[PDB]
């Protein structure tokens, strides 16, 4: 079947010229709303949630891990690293790296998380350990953002990512202390006000992680605490046919607004 919400998302997609993927989970009733829910999309920096969560999981067996310094060297800087560049020739802890990766989208910070996990495949291994058979991380920053149409590297589906994000933030994939830390980090994101946040009632509280890449790839994954009902999990992924296409965070806001209006 095609629901009213799905036909509105298709109309949005048509006007946009790109390809839109949406997955909602309403945790009150566990119901889902999917648009291209099983198609793959390049994750870009939304993948940083999985990496930070994998380090949080390691910290469950190592109480001091998050206070562990990681050398930052000049050669570690990549394309976008506003936090890490202030610590070149110095150190950041894994908590600091996690916070920078999630809340500022620092790419050097993400590379340190990936290295702590043994490379991209360590992030994939964690995904598998928490029941996500779909996610794959294949490269480091910045190349994981190439977002080439048809390329499976560094992709997931909306359905899989919504289910993962629920398990991480609201479920029991992480220990309680760690779940709370992830939620705190997501709620303090600095980059999200134009994306899912922008299509929802302002009284709701959102924690999210955005992504951006080539092909005008514009992504957001969010946990949402609406006024008056149980939390929601929402993934909005968007990618365009031209390598140097413009960001379209408005499309994500519009998708979120359609979802909200369909609840």
Residues classed as catalytic:
45
Q: Contacting ligand CB4 (CB under 6 A), which of 35, 41, 80, 126?
A: 80
CB of 134 to ligand CB4, least distance (A): 19
CA geometry: angle at 142 spanning 136 and 145, to 5°?
55
**Between 8 and 48, CB nearer to ligand CB4:** 48
Can residue 105 be called a binding residue for ligand CB4 (CB under 6 A)?
A: yes
Site string for ligand CB4, 229-258 (x = CB under 6 A): ------------------------------
- Sequence-distant (6+) residues with CB within 8 A of 233 are 23, 24, 25, 27, 162, 165, 166, 169, 170, 222, 223, 224
Taking the least distance from each CB to ligand CB4, the nearer of 26 and 208 is 208
x/- mask, ligand CB4, residues 155-194, rule CB under 6 A, reads ----------------------------------------
CA 96, 100, 109, 42 dihedral sign is: positive
The answer to whether the CB of 215 falls within 8 A of the CB of 97 is: no
Residues 190/104, Cβ–Cβ less than 8 Å: yes
Name the residues that contact ligand CB4, by CB under 6 A: 44-45, 79-80, 105, 107, 142, 145, 210-214
């Amino acid at each position: 079947q095609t629901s009213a919400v799905q036909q509105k998302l298709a109309a949005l997609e048509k006007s946009s010229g790109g390809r839109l993927g949406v997955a909602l989970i309403d945790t009150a009733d566990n119901t889902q709303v999917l648009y291209r829910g099983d198609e793959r999309f390049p994750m870009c920096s939304t993948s940083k949630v999985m990496a930070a969560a994998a380090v949080l999981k390691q910290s469950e067996t190592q109480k001091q891990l998050l206070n562990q310094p990681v050398e930052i060297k000049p050669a570690d800087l990549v394309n976008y690293n506003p936090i890490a560049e202030k610590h070149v020739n110095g150190t950041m802890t894994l908590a600091e790296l996690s916070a920078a990766a999630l809340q500022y989208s620092d790419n050097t910070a993400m590379n340190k998380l990936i290295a702590q996990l043994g490379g991209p495949g360590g992030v994939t291994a964690f995904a598998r350990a928490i029941g996500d058979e779909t996610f794959r991380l294949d490269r480091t920053e910045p190349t994981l953002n190439t977002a080439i149409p048809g390329d499976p590297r560094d992709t997931t589906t909306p359905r899989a990512m919504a289910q993962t994000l629920r398990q991480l933030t609201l479920g029991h994939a992480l220990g309680e202390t760690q779940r709370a830390q992830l939620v705190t980090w997501l709620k303090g994101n600095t980059t999200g006000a134009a994306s899912i946040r922008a299509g929802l009632p302002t009284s709701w509280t959102v924690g999210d992680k955005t992504g951006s890449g080539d092909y005008g790839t514009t992504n957001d994954i969010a946990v949402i605490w609406p006024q008056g009902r149980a939390p929601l999990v929402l993934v909005t992924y968007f990618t365009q046919p031209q390598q140097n296409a413009e960001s379209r965070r408005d499309v994500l806001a519009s998708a979120a607004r359609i979802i909200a209006e369909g609840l």
